[PDB]
Design a protein around this ligand. Sequence first.
Ligand SMILES: [Mg+2]
Length: 258
Amino acid sequence: GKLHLRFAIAPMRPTPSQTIKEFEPIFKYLADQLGATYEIVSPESWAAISVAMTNGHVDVGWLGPWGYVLSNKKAGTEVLATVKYRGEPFYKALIVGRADLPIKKWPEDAKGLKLSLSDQGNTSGWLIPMAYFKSIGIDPASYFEYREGATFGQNESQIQHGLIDLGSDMDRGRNGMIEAGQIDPSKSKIVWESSKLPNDAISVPKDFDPALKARITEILTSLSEEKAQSLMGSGYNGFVKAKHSDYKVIEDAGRILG
Ligand SMILES: [Mg+2]
């Protein structure tokens, strides 16, 4: 009678090893509160963690917003809580450019430039920038010299080294890379920033044990900002109780894109 939990976390940092090193402590804390043993993985892409949850491989997953919406539609995955960054359950999508890129008439002056978006399960990296371009009648695949599937770490590296012109990122991710000395911010600039988006979703499978679900929610949402920050990467400092309707803006964007 030894309780065991399978954990997964999305690409919070540029590599899976950095993500696990910095964020495992919150999962270890959660398991210890329950007297559970555990295992943990961090897939390379935002799509991959959504798929792992949908296919029955994960008990408690830290999914991105679009990854949660997709898994809920396909398998009935439930959101229990939303992560806080700087005390708020929100964040912004970015399009970043080379520092010397002419942008005074953006994006009408950008035809044929090299643009890299992320995997199709990535909210800020793919869904939101695609929705932006469609809202102004631009098809990125024909308008730009276009690539899809890159990680946020790859986008920022390639911009800094002059291999692409433009790439997607999220504000909380870019901040962490600057803070860790992984980006020289003098070599890039923010070209576009979205409106506020709901943050990542702490998620469980459909019909996960009801008693355990309630306990998990209480353990995470009762944490002080100081204690939460001591267990996670810089800026991540708590959890708030959440439900499906908190993700409406993401569901709406997905539906409009088809
Ligand atoms: Mg507590």
